[PDB]
Amino acid sequence: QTTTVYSLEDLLPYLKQDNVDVKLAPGTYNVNGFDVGEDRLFSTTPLFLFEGSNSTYDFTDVKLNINTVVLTKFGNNEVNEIQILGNNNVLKNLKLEDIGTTAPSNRAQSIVIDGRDNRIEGFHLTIRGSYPYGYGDAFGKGGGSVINHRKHSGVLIRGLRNHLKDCTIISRSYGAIVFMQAASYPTVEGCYIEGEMRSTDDMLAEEGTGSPADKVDFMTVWGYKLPAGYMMSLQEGGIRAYNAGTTYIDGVEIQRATDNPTVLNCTIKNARTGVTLAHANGTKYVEGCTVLGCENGYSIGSGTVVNCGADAIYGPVFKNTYGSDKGYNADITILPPSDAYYNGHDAVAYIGGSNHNLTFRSEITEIPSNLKIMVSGDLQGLRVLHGSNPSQNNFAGTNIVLRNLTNFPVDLHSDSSNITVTSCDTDNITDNGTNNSIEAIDC
């Protein structure tokens, strides 16, 4: 019942067909610059466009090496390795690696999941090739950049009820690793997602070298010179939902925000954020995740974070995104450090908005002297200094339950009100707010 093919060339015709079961034979397949052209293997991007429905593709023991030169072979167009347009497809076990570090002519996405009821499982993806690489978003992630970018992102989940399951996604590229645009009921489950980090001090040491950042005197898009003392990811978000986007389902082009995302049992390491879903609508649910060495742990805006952990070595484990946040229910374990602390944000959590129920647990006994749980106040966050991103800082918190089962101190700013705090110790709580309740608990 399964058709086995032995070349990429033989594989491609099956992509336009419905109801097929195909296996690409174990082996290594290389895609080079010479494979792109009019009479070549790939005359268009996306390279692999899955247009059929109700099909299964088995990539067990297949290694697909794509030279990043391919990212420049299509003119000034976005290049995608895989795009799924059809429905009810299952793609499994592929090991895909970007070879070299050549940047795109415009931008690239490794995998794009449109349509409905699709699943990608057991993939091992390595993402490379982007510009600039080494600054994170300090010099621009969208329009009006200080340094123009050529981004290369990992898995873009769109469509309806699309499912990423048990994949490993390693990025050494400036771009989001797993992200959602116009996705309805996307699920990310059991994935390992990993970027890498660089200190702003190391970036600032490019002074006098003639680097791209040296040429702009390290002036960031946030309106100030890049500050020392922070650890940045070279990637964008680990798992991030966007509030805009376009998707294609059953012949229909759809422009909408992401809605109803679910993230289960994922591990995210060294990205700009662990799980950020505040811009998604509907029900947000995050369970069983581990976030290590990210610039921010969990920010879902509203919904449930349960049985999740994050360490605090490079940024807070928890951040309310806006003063409009409402109904954020979270139980987060502050994990032992995965490396030495280098947290310039001076906070393990920043809490605001209203009607939250927050529990923090930890076994940590050595508390860095700069780290505290903040309810309201002036977060010293890399991107929210000096009035930058003003809606994401300096906002009030009201009617919040805060169960602090940790040794971390708590600072309730004067803009806090009706905060019900329970804590292992009350001696390290500073309360400058209005009508707050503070009670001790035994352990």
Residue numbers in the entry: 1 to 443
Provide excerpts from the study:
FdlA from Flavobacterium sp. SA-0082 is an endo-type fucoidan-degrading enzyme that cleaves the sulfated fuco-glucuronomannan (SFGM) through a lytic mechanism. We show that the FdlA-NTD adopts a right-handed parallel β-helix fold, and possesses a substrate binding site composed of a long groove and a unique alkaline pocket. Our structural, biochemical, and enzymological analyses strongly suggest that FdlA-NTD utilizes catalytic residues different from other β-helix polysaccharide lyases, potentially representing a novel polysaccharide lyase family. Here, we report crystal structures and enzymological characterization of wild type (WT) and eight single mutants of the catalytic N-terminal domain (NTD) of FdlA, revealing its unique substrate binding pocket and identifying the key catalytic residues.
Residue His176 is located close to Tyr242, and the H176A mutation shows a slight influence on the Tyr242 side chain conformation. Therefore, mutation of Phe179 and His176 possibly results in the dysfunction of Tyr242 and hence loss of the catalytic activity of FdlA-NTD. In addition, His176 forms a hydrogen bond (2.8 Å) with the hydroxyl group of Tyr242 side chain in WT, implying another possibility that it might play a role in providing a proton to Tyr242 to facilitate the catalytic reaction. Next, the positively charged residues including Arg240 and His176, which are located near the +1 subsite, neutralize the C-5 carboxyl group of D-GlcUA at +1 subsite, thus reducing the pKa of the C-5 proton, making it more susceptible to the attack by a base.
